[PDB]
PDB file of C-alpha atoms in Angstrom:
ATOM      1  CA  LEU A   1      -4.550   0.127  11.371  1.00 19.34           C
ATOM      2  CA  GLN A   2      -7.305   3.120  11.240  1.00 16.46           C
ATOM      3  CA  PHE A   3      -9.792   4.238   8.582  1.00 14.72           C
ATOM      4  CA  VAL A   4     -12.333   6.855   8.069  1.00 14.88           C
ATOM      5  CA  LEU A   5     -15.022   5.529   5.746  1.00 15.76           C
ATOM      6  CA  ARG A   6     -17.594   7.822   4.300  1.00 16.57           C
ATOM      7  CA  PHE A   7     -21.311   6.901   3.650  1.00 13.23           C
ATOM      8  CA  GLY A   8     -23.590   8.534   1.169  1.00 13.37           C
ATOM      9  CA  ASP A   9     -26.577   7.864   3.418  1.00 10.31           C
ATOM     10  CA  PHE A  10     -27.736   6.442   6.778  1.00 11.42           C
ATOM     11  CA  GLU A  11     -29.363   3.278   5.182  1.00 12.42           C
ATOM     12  CA  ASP A  12     -25.786   2.186   4.029  1.00 10.94           C
ATOM     13  CA  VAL A  13     -24.501   2.327   7.667  1.00  9.03           C
ATOM     14  CA  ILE A  14     -27.518   0.254   8.822  1.00  8.13           C
ATOM     15  CA  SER A  15     -26.830  -2.232   6.062  1.00  9.39           C
ATOM     16  CA  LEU A  16     -23.175  -2.539   7.053  1.00 10.82           C
ATOM     17  CA  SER A  17     -24.103  -2.962  10.686  1.00  9.21           C
ATOM     18  CA  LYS A  18     -26.408  -5.836   9.954  1.00  5.39           C
ATOM     19  CA  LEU A  19     -23.455  -7.606   8.654  1.00  4.33           C
ATOM     20  CA  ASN A  20     -21.811  -8.356  12.027  1.00  5.61           C
ATOM     21  CA  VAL A  21     -18.594  -7.109  10.594  1.00  6.26           C
ATOM     22  CA  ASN A  22     -18.317  -4.338  13.387  1.00  6.68           C
ATOM     23  CA  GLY A  23     -14.830  -4.483  13.288  1.00  5.81           C
ATOM     24  CA  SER A  24     -13.639  -3.763  16.723  1.00  6.96           C
ATOM     25  CA  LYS A  25     -13.914  -0.177  17.668  1.00  4.29           C
ATOM     26  CA  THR A  26     -16.248   2.139  15.384  1.00  3.15           C
ATOM     27  CA  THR A  27     -17.294   5.565  15.896  1.00  5.51           C
ATOM     28  CA  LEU A  28     -19.760   7.326  13.933  1.00  6.78           C
ATOM     29  CA  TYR A  29     -20.072  11.092  12.978  1.00  5.65           C
ATOM     30  CA  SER A  30     -22.168  13.102  10.471  1.00  4.28           C
ATOM     31  CA  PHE A  31     -20.691  15.820   8.566  1.00  2.00           C
ATOM     32  CA  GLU A  32     -22.074  17.853   5.547  1.00  2.00           C
ATOM     33  CA  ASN A  33     -24.948  15.568   4.678  1.00  2.00           C
ATOM     34  CA  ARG A  34     -22.717  12.397   4.960  1.00  2.00           C
ATOM     35  CA  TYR A  35     -21.993   9.825   7.540  1.00  2.00           C
ATOM     36  CA  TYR A  36     -18.284   8.977   8.619  1.00  2.00           C
ATOM     37  CA  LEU A  37     -17.337   5.875  10.473  1.00  2.00           C
ATOM     38  CA  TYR A  38     -14.005   5.992  12.235  1.00  2.65           C
ATOM     39  CA  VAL A  39     -12.767   2.399  12.170  1.00  2.00           C
ATOM     40  CA  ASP A  40      -9.999   0.996  14.421  1.00  2.00           C
ATOM     41  CA  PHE A  41      -9.165  -2.557  13.686  1.00  6.37           C
ATOM     42  CA  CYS A  42      -6.703  -1.962  16.577  1.00  3.87           C
ATOM     43  CA  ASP A  43      -5.555  -5.569  16.859  1.00  2.35           C
ATOM     44  CA  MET A  44      -6.791  -8.096  14.234  1.00  2.00           C
ATOM     45  CA  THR A  45      -4.801  -9.822  11.643  1.00  2.04           C
ATOM     46  CA  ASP A  46      -3.907  -8.561   8.129  1.00  2.00           C
ATOM     47  CA  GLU A  47      -6.396 -11.328   7.169  1.00  3.60           C
ATOM     48  CA  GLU A  48      -9.494 -10.650   9.335  1.00  2.00           C
ATOM     49  CA  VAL A  49      -9.038  -7.011   8.353  1.00  4.08           C
ATOM     50  CA  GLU A  50      -8.820  -7.546   4.555  1.00  4.02           C
ATOM     51  CA  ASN A  51     -12.027  -9.251   4.265  1.00  6.11           C
ATOM     52  CA  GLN A  52     -13.613  -6.922   6.779  1.00  6.49           C
ATOM     53  CA  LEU A  53     -12.593  -3.756   5.106  1.00  8.73           C
ATOM     54  CA  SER A  54     -13.695  -5.163   1.634  1.00  7.61           C
ATOM     55  CA  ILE A  55     -17.341  -5.704   2.903  1.00  9.12           C
ATOM     56  CA  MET A  56     -17.282  -2.298   4.499  1.00  5.10           C
ATOM     57  CA  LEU A  57     -16.255  -0.832   1.142  1.00  6.63           C
ATOM     58  CA  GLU A  58     -19.321  -1.942  -0.562  1.00  8.95           C
ATOM     59  CA  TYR A  59     -21.312   0.517   1.516  1.00  5.88           C
ATOM     60  CA  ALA A  60     -18.864   3.275   1.761  1.00  5.23           C
ATOM     61  CA  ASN A  61     -15.701   4.713   0.241  1.00  3.49           C
ATOM     62  CA  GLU A  62     -12.224   5.635   2.025  1.00  5.85           C
ATOM     63  CA  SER A  63     -12.109   9.212   3.120  1.00  5.39           C
ATOM     64  CA  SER A  64      -9.174  11.597   3.698  1.00  6.58           C
ATOM     65  CA  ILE A  65     -11.585  13.617   5.849  1.00  6.14           C
ATOM     66  CA  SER A  66      -9.562  13.917   9.161  1.00  7.68           C
ATOM     67  CA  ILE A  67     -10.788  12.572  12.546  1.00  7.50           C
ATOM     68  CA  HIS A  68      -9.909  16.094  13.805  1.00  8.53           C
ATOM     69  CA  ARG A  69     -11.851  17.823  11.189  1.00  4.61           C
ATOM     70  CA  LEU A  70     -14.909  15.603  12.312  1.00  5.08           C
ATOM     71  CA  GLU A  71     -14.222  16.103  16.012  1.00  4.41           C
ATOM     72  CA  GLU A  72     -14.532  19.988  15.875  1.00  4.05           C
ATOM     73  CA  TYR A  73     -16.931  20.420  13.006  1.00  2.00           C
ATOM     74  CA  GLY A  74     -18.943  17.079  12.870  1.00  2.00           C
ATOM     75  CA  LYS A  75     -21.827  15.624  15.010  1.00  2.00           C
ATOM     76  CA  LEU A  76     -20.548  12.798  17.164  1.00  2.00           C
ATOM     77  CA  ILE A  77     -23.416  10.202  17.064  1.00  2.00           C
ATOM     78  CA  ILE A  78     -22.091   7.206  18.625  1.00  2.00           C
ATOM     79  CA  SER A  79     -18.549   6.539  20.071  1.00  2.00           C
ATOM     80  CA  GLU A  80     -16.577   3.267  20.238  1.00  2.00           C
ATOM     81  CA  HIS A  81     -19.225   0.682  19.562  1.00  2.00           C
ATOM     82  CA  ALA A  82     -21.158   2.489  16.687  1.00  2.00           C
ATOM     83  CA  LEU A  83     -22.007  -0.398  14.488  1.00  2.00           C
ATOM     84  CA  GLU A  84     -23.226  -2.721  17.205  1.00  2.00           C
ATOM     85  CA  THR A  85     -25.460   0.185  18.499  1.00  2.00           C
ATOM     86  CA  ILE A  86     -26.843   0.953  15.094  1.00  2.00           C
ATOM     87  CA  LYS A  87     -27.313  -2.949  14.506  1.00  2.00           C
ATOM     88  CA  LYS A  88     -29.246  -3.125  17.675  1.00  2.00           C
ATOM     89  CA  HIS A  89     -31.714  -0.118  17.221  1.00  2.00           C
ATOM     90  CA  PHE A  90     -31.904   0.070  13.455  1.00  2.00           C
ATOM     91  CA  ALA A  91     -31.284  -3.256  11.885  1.00  2.00           C
ATOM     92  CA  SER A  92     -34.227  -5.327  10.281  1.00  2.00           C
TER      93      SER A  92
END
């Protein structure tokens, strides 16, 4: 299933990325001073997903902010492989 997670600041996004929990597809946006990770676990198991989500939620909170909201009024930063891209250029 799909999730939009909100981060209070960029460092927490970088922190998450270092964890190698880049849960299949992730797209990253900014909006109103915060960062939003669109997170698609498309095909994973209800187990891999549970432990994955739960770490993501140490650095973020579940948001009701719609992906369409973000698409038209947010800045798209990275699509599809966001956490991997952030880890590569920002992590460590």
